[PDB]
Write an enzyme that holds these catalytic residues in place. Sequence first.
Site, PDB file in Angstrom:
ATOM      1  N   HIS A  19       0.806  -1.215   0.000  1.00 21.61           N
ATOM      2  CA  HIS A  19       0.000   0.000   0.000  1.00 21.61           C
ATOM      3  C   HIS A  19       0.838   1.264   0.000  1.00 21.61           C
ATOM      4  CE1 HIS A  19       0.844   0.761   4.217  1.00 21.61           C
ATOM      5  NE2 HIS A  19       0.139  -0.270   4.649  1.00 21.61           N
TER       6      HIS A  19
ATOM      7  N   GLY B  96       3.323   6.339   9.807  1.00 17.55           N
ATOM      8  CA  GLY B  96       4.685   6.076   9.399  1.00 17.55           C
ATOM      9  C   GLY B  96       5.288   4.813   9.973  1.00 17.55           C
TER      10      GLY B  96
ATOM     11  N   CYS C 275       4.189   1.782   9.458  1.00 18.46           N
ATOM     12  CA  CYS C 275       4.028   0.637   8.573  1.00 18.46           C
ATOM     13  C   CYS C 275       5.383   0.184   8.050  1.00 18.46           C
ATOM     14  CB  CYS C 275       3.092   0.988   7.406  1.00 18.46           C
ATOM     15  SG  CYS C 275       1.403   1.366   7.944  1.00 18.46           S
TER      16      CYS C 275
HETATM   17  C1  LIG Z   1       1.402   3.103   8.251  1.00 12.07           C
HETATM   18  N1  LIG Z   1       2.417   3.724   7.767  1.00 12.07           N
HETATM   19  C2  LIG Z   1       0.060   3.752   8.144  1.00 12.07           C
HETATM   20  C3  LIG Z   1      -0.556   3.704   6.732  1.00 12.07           C
HETATM   21  N2  LIG Z   1      -1.705   2.802   6.889  1.00 12.07           N
HETATM   22  C4  LIG Z   1      -2.451   2.335   5.761  1.00 12.07           C
HETATM   23  C5  LIG Z   1      -2.153   2.770   4.480  1.00 12.07           C
HETATM   24  C6  LIG Z   1      -2.841   2.250   3.400  1.00 12.07           C
HETATM   25  C7  LIG Z   1      -3.817   1.295   3.645  1.00 12.07           C
HETATM   26  C8  LIG Z   1      -4.580   0.635   2.528  1.00 12.07           C
HETATM   27  F1  LIG Z   1      -5.860   0.543   2.795  1.00 12.07           F
HETATM   28  F2  LIG Z   1      -4.140  -0.585   2.258  1.00 12.07           F
HETATM   29  F3  LIG Z   1      -4.486   1.296   1.417  1.00 12.07           F
HETATM   30  N3  LIG Z   1      -4.133   0.876   4.879  1.00 12.07           N
HETATM   31  C9  LIG Z   1      -3.459   1.391   5.917  1.00 12.07           C
HETATM   32  C10 LIG Z   1      -1.939   2.479   8.211  1.00 12.07           C
HETATM   33  O1  LIG Z   1      -2.863   1.805   8.642  1.00 12.07           O
HETATM   34  N4  LIG Z   1      -0.967   3.099   8.971  1.00 12.07           N
HETATM   35  C11 LIG Z   1      -0.891   3.013  10.388  1.00 12.07           C
HETATM   36  C12 LIG Z   1      -0.440   1.875  11.048  1.00 12.07           C
HETATM   37  N5  LIG Z   1      -0.369   1.733  12.375  1.00 12.07           N
HETATM   38  C13 LIG Z   1      -0.750   2.761  13.120  1.00 12.07           C
HETATM   39  C14 LIG Z   1      -1.227   3.991  12.596  1.00 12.07           C
HETATM   40  C15 LIG Z   1      -1.604   5.084  13.414  1.00 12.07           C
HETATM   41  C16 LIG Z   1      -2.045   6.249  12.855  1.00 12.07           C
HETATM   42  C17 LIG Z   1      -2.140   6.380  11.482  1.00 12.07           C
HETATM   43  C18 LIG Z   1      -1.784   5.353  10.657  1.00 12.07           C
HETATM   44  C19 LIG Z   1      -1.306   4.121  11.184  1.00 12.07           C
END
Ligand SMILES: *C(=N)[C@H]1CN(c2ccc(C(F)(F)F)nc2)C(=O)N1c1cncc2ccccc12
Lengths: 306, 306
Positions: free
Chosen positions: B41, B143, B145
């Site tokens: 992603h 950030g 991820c």
């Molecule tokens: C991790 N860097 C971020 C990004 N993220 C996320 C991005 C894209 C997608 C999809 F649907 F596949 F396109 N899904 C998820 C995500 O969930 N992130 C993340 C991870 N752990 C904690 C947090 C806390 C706050 C904000 C984002 C988080």
Amino acid sequence: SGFRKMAFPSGKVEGCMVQVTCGTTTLNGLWLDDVVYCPRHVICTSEDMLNPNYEDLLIRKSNHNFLVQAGNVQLRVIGHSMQNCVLKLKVDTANPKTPKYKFVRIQPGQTFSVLACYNGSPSGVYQCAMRPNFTIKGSFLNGSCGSVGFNIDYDCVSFCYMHHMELPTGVHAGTDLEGNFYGPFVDRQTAQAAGTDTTITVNVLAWLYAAVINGDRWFLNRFTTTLNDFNLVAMKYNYEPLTQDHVDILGPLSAQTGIAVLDMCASLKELLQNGMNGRTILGSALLEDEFTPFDVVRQCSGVTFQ
Amino acid sequence: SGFRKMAFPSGKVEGCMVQVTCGTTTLNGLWLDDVVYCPRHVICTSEDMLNPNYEDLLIRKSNHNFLVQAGNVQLRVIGHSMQNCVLKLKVDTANPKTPKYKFVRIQPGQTFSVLACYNGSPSGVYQCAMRPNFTIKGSFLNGSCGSVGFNIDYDCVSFCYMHHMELPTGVHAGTDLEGNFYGPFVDRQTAQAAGTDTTITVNVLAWLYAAVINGDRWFLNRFTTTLNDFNLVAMKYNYEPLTQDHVDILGPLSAQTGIAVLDMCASLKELLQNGMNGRTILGSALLEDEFTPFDVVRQCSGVTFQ
Ligand SMILES: *C(=N)[C@H]1CN(c2ccc(C(F)(F)F)nc2)C(=O)N1c1cncc2ccccc12
Ligand SMILES: *C(=N)[C@H]1CN(c2ccc(C(F)(F)F)nc2)C(=O)N1c1cncc2ccccc12
């Protein structure tokens, strides 16, 4: 989201851990430049420990009575000396993996990471607080002496603790890296009382802010208090007094949450007096005091290191 | 003495963390030999995320749309490909700090260390369990991820988890290092239910043994039970069934403590039915299930690593 007991990355410290043997005694040392640091009680026999004369015992030791090992490598000891309760073994080769480092003496209520080791090899890493009575609630087995506690600031490892002893009461005691004990303790096998342990009030407030930042806020009330009135309640419950310096340190979390520090104090006052009524805060059924305000800010804002 | 939530030393993993940027999106990657692994992603825009066609999106990307950085070093991407939900960026230089490693898919109830990172830099390390509903209760900010979870076996890092997402419910989900999600989750921004979470029964028994080894044993009673009768009580309280494999895994702790596994089960049965009556076990007012039997044995016997 989420809040966990989090240690610093241990890589820079891992490369400094070695094994120190004297007779039948094996423990851990810290190898920085051409010096290995370890507890001076490594030179004691089982009979020496009840009342050692460390000056006399050390005079009886030769360089070759100290067997230092880093992995497959034997380190030749060029000289041995004593700084307070810490032995300094000068070796003929400087550790190529020596990070940038400082020695610091931390304050009761401050936290650090412990890299627990056995035979000079890292077993695991966990966060501790220096209790108000200058003990730590660690996880240490035999052979764990010489494991160190540390913080990381930017690119610099601040060594603050070296493990020396488990007391007959099961709790843990040690020194700074200049060999000065934290607390009233001495390195002899005798019964030693730690003080009444108290709860680190500013840390509990920090953790309540952490709960709020994470959406966990059932404990908030509509009250405020004065610092004086709060403190009168806190001493009844063996909580350390809260100072204006503590209020000032909590400022950033107050601003992030929109909850005044004295308002959070009013919430803690009622938790102390009423209990939690079978609820939990951040997955705990007890008030937690081993997170500093800085720990919370670092975890809830993502401070990193070189 | 003492019992703490303890992570593995993180040094071998620290040298593998890099930063991966695509457009405005920056996250973490894992650099092993000449391959950088990260969540696929990373290639999505904010509009792509609701229903991405990853095959189509990836075809639109060039090597130069992937900015990989290790410290001050820019890594040139030679090729990009997709393995399930994980992007593989081949780079022109193999990581000199590549440890011996395996990719493993862990079982619900098993634990691992998370090295949480931001911008390719380690922030901290903490132990997690893979919940029975295949989520983890982490501490992750934006950030984060691409941060990975791992175990260490002798001299080998077993990578088992890569962080992909925080669900709208605040809990965390990700993949093995072949890019297969743990649990029913998909990498799109949609509402996804996790299952009913259950308590890991064999882990709670392990932690009760840990309490006994540390002298904390008020909860022991003079009863026994059958595996069948215990299980009938445990399902009422949302505890996973206990199998004969679980009893066999607890054997070593039974022998060290002199407490039969089914006797400890009888003690847990009464704790579930009566509560703890305002007492604590190993400094906790709740039953803890994020320690495996192996975790307890490793901590209470001092297993170390190269
Ligand atoms: C991790 N860097 C971020 C990004 N993220 C996320 C991005 C894209 C997608 C999809 F649907 F596949 F396109 N899904 C998820 C995500 O969930 N992130 C993340 C991870 N752990 C904690 C947090 C806390 C706050 C904000 C984002 C988080
Ligand atoms: C650490 N390796 C051991 C040794 N030790 C200890 C040795 C000597 C002396 C004295 F009095 F100065 F001579 N005092 C203490 C000690 O306390 N150790 C220790 C440390 N942490 C935990 C444990 C657990 C079990 C046994 C020993 C432990």
